[PDB]
Amino acid sequence: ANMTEGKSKKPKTLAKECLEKYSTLRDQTDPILIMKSEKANENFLWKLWRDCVNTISNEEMSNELQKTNYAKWATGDGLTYQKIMKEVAIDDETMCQEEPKIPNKCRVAAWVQTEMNLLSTLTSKRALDLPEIGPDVAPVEHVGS
């Protein structure tokens, strides 16, 4: 949270200022991995996060990542199959049709109930603001108000 006078600023500047306020978290460059899911590369994700922070904190105004080549493989974009003309596919006997992936059958989880309990409670902060409408003269608009 960064308290402000209300002036609206570009999201890049807002993120830069919020990170600047919390400099200890921004400058943290030694990760302490807690749990890597199944296949995600800790190094790829951490380097991508550091690139994000550096891009947000740079003096420039463009939000594009400054690597554009490490991020190609960190996001897994580079691991995409290469299209080939249909003839080679017909002749290649090892090119089959991938079996459909069926969603896993899972059981009830205790975190959905906790989320339902927590999200439907009053907080000290409201993010809902709406425009104004013209004055009300009829009683019907009074009851609506």
Binding site: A89, I90, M95, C96, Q97, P131, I133, G134, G144
Partner: protein
Amino acid sequence: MNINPYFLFIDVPIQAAISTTFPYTGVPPYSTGTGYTIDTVIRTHEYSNKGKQYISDVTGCTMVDPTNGPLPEDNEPSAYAQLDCVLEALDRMDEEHPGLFQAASQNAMETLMVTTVDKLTQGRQTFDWTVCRNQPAATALNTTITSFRLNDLNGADKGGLIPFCQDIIDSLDRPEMTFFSVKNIKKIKRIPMKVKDKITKVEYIKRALSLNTMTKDAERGKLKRRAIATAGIQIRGFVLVVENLAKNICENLEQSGLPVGGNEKKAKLSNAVAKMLSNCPPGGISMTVTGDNTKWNECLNPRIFLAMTERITRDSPIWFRDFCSIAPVLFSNKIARLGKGFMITSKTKRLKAQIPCPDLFSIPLERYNEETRAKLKKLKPFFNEEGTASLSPGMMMGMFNMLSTVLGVAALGIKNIGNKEYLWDGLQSSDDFALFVNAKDEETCMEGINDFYRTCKLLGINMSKKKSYCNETGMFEFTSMFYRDGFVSNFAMELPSFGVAGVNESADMAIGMTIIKNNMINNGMGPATAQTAIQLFIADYRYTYKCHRGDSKVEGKRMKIIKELWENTKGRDGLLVADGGPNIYNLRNLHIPEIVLKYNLMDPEYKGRLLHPQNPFVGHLSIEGIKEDYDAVSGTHSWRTKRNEEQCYAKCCNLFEACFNSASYRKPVGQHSMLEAMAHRLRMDARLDYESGRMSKDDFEKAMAHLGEIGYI
């Protein structure tokens, strides 16, 4: 304390809170459709595989005829509709409605005689045979008209729809068929151009009978997808006439009623319930069956619809009887284009490749997954070498809606079987039906429901036993509208996103306010909901057009000038919201444009600038869309968007309108070429300018020389 939302039903009826049960705030399901189209074909033929299988001599396809076939012996969907039973139902419907068929036929004929070719420009994307793709209705229509000129088929120039449809019918006989096709040359740039291509008769017939397919998108309430289809221009006019006839029939029917919109659905439901309850005998019981047919269009046969069209037009000129019989004929011999093919990949080589549908069986079936393997194995009999599958039985969604509703109402109107002690009647609309049975006990009501189910089996109408249930009369649902104890709770119509229509500032504001007011009037929107809708629309309007209140702290290119205008203008409540002014719209004044609403509060110079009669942000040619309906005003906020035989017609008509400003508003009248009229009016304009001093001698001499070059001196 563990919150349970369903507990809100303990103290409130489910119907009252049914709105929350409906998920209409998330993302509707979205999709290749080749597998779904093949599945639809397989299902359609499975329900008809006990009929008659033959070979279509005209096209060479494999045709299946379930009509007049064996009666069903199980509870699976059946397409074996007996013709005699359908004729019985239609004869009963005629008996209960004297001269409704004749009146509808006469009205359809009279409207057809007046309809023009341009009427086919209305609708959605249509299949274009010249390119074998999906293109807007106007694009397909003008492409077909142009390609018919190359074949000496000049019925489009005759005006009315009858000559154009006659030339469409004639085109099916031409030994060849010449047209203009888009060819891409690599010059490296891929340049498309028109080439005079030819196709023999059989390919043209296949293209005309062909139905393009895709996967229906944003179909909420269904876990799995289906196949939606679009037809070409060859069947558009005939389908239009047959649908007009069916609508003429079904508007009079009280079971279906004139297709109801808005809150007329509530009136229909209430009238049906009250009428049935009144009809209920003393001490008897009335049971309402909330029914739902799923994939009921796959068991409806175009041959049955041909029979209904023949029966409906019993007393009509043979020309109209033949005209109305062409849409069923072209639907019984339809061809289903199959998606875009399957994709096969090897992960040991990280390679992928799409297999075009014409080459579905060029690969051994062992290289497909099990479900696709079985699908293709069952599809092989009806597969065409050109990458399509013949689909004779069944009907795709949205083609014959009024006619299918007429058939359903005919089924409803039987009202009894065997003089038993029960009377049934109901409501039918586009695959959704609700039934009511009055009898002397629950057992007799269930007997009546069973009899109705069996009777519907005889007409090709199948009702889902999994989706249909029954209860005592007084609580049911129809067309996603829940009636309970005289209270109707329609809560399945998603309120359209209250955002700018994206045409221009003034028009967008007028459209948004009119939409909110229309929602209040029709969809039972309450006051507070309408006010919140106004607030949300104003937020979206300010976000889109970068028009926030001048007193706000927002920054931007336009916001700087808005802030300047905030203080340079004394009267602050008269500014339009697009100029940083305050919104003053409330429930009472949703029908008055804000330009008028703020006219008295506008500053003397602000109105002049905004309402400057000669300002650059308005052009005449941008007024075409002013009508289509919203009420607004002309001003600096009335600009248009940049543009992202097409140009021929575009420029010719633009010049026609420019010369005569009346052609834009009302249809011109004349029995002569447009060129001669243009020349004559230009001569008159030049003479008037020369007389009034607006033009010089040399200019008029040049104009006359040009006119002579045209050849009208």
